[PDB]
């Protein structure tokens, strides 16, 4: 079984919606290109049908292995990678199209098939460029301010740096004629420090 | 509140016991120097007394209750969840657990004098065959260290941990743990 992530060019500009959030140094976006949101809806529908059926699959958990995992947050199956195997016998899974990690049981895992791995994984890890925490850790305040800048919004992302594990982006809100660069907000408000 | 980790010099050899394990690239050790084990016990007893009688922020120190053995230990706040629960990193052992607000207490500054003792380690000069450490590799590493004091040589010191070469000296025949994992096809050479 093999798979890919969404791929970018340096300085590519592309619209995003943030699908998961941990900090300004760690958040996940859907990049709205190549009919992503629609292809991802279609795949998920196909996973519901596939996963729905009796009997389910014998899945053997191994670290970094792809699977289908049930997400109790909304009661549907999604694509996932095994992240951890716990003493209890439960398994933590990384939901690859969204960026959240959940602890599941063995009944909540099913083997994935190669035809469900054609669409690139859509939960792209991001960080804002040119900022750093005032001390050594992102504060709740800095994170909640960031969240209030992106919630319910589509933003322009410029892909400034590409690493193996994700992308550093500059995020701009273009929902009005006054562009708002999210980092500006966080720096101005004293919630984060300039970096670089 | 401010604190430190156990400090080392490059190529320092010191005895260890592994206190928490995740993979050959991520395991935690007590380094047996400067009366560490004894000073940590002493500290833990002081904490049990103090806790027996907190505003969460990411990276903030505290006392947290560990349900595995039912005692209080030093921790840093790692995550704050929607439920209102908090994940804490037990800084003297290296495990992370989800606790409730009742399982947290502020820590006193005098409890932050002993350096934090769960030192993150990785074995130097090896890598996963594919992209991730397998269960078999980790399980074999665990078999090599369970119940054992090993000699560690600190080869590289980073901000976030130490790369070590581990040797079992429990018999006259020294056993370098990486050797075992490489020889048995479980990990690939690196460097």
């Amino acid at each position: 079984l093999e798979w890919t992530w969404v791929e970018f060019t340096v300085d590519e500009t592309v619209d995003v919606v943030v699908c998961m959030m941990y900090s300004p140094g760690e958040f996940y976006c859907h990049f709205l290109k190549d009919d992503a949101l629609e292809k991802l809806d279609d795949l998920n529908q196909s996973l519901a049908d596939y996963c729905a059926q009796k009997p389910p699959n014998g899945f053997k958990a191994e670290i970094g292995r792809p699977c289908c995992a049930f997400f109790s947050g909304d009661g549907n199956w999604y694509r996932a990678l095994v992240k951890e195997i716990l003493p209890s016998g439960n398994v933590k899974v990384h939901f690859v199209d969204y960026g959240n990690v959940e602890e599941v049981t063995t009944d909540q895992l099913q083997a994935i098939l190669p035809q469900f791995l054609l669409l690139p994984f859509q939960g792209m890890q991001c960080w804002l460029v040119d900022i750093q925490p005032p001390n050594k850790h992102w504060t709740k305040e800095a994170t909640a301010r960031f969240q209030a800048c992106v919630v319910g919004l589509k933003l322009q992302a410029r892909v400034v740096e590409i690493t193996a594990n994700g992308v550093g982006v500059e995020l701009t809100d273009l929902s009005t004629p006054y562009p708002k660069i999210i980092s500006d907000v966080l720096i101005r408000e004293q919630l984060v420090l300039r970096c670089g | 509140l401010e604190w430190t980790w156990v400090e080392f010099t490059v190529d320092e050899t010191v005895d260890v016991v592994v206190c928490m394990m995740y993979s050959p690239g991520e395991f935690y050790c007590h380094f047996l120097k400067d009366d560490a084990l004894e000073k940590l016990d002493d500290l833990n007893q002081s904490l049990a007394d103090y806790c027996a009688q907190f505003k969460a922020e990411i990276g903030r120190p505290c006392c947290a209750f560990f349900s595995g053995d039912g005692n209080w230990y030093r921790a840093l706040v790692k995550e704050i969840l929607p439920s209102g629960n908090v994940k804490v990193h037990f800084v003297d052992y290296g495990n992370v657990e989800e606790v409730t607000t009742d399982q947290l207490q502020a820590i006193l500054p005098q409890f932050l004098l002993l350096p934090f003792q769960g030192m993150q380690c990785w074995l130097v000069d090896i890598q996963p065959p594919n992209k991730h450490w397998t269960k078999e590799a980790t399980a074999r590493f665990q078999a090599c260290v369970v119940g054992l004091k090993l000699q560690a040589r600190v080869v590289e010191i980073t901000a976030n941990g130490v790369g070590v070469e581990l040797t079992d000296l429990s018999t006259p025949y020294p056993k370098i743990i990486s050797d075992v994992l490489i020889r048995e096809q479980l990990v690939l050479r690196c460097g």
Partner: peptide, 8 residues
């Protein structure tokens, strides 16, 4: 509650 923000 669904994919809710987790402070890290």
């Amino acid at each position: 509650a669904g994919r809710g923000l987790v402070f890290r």
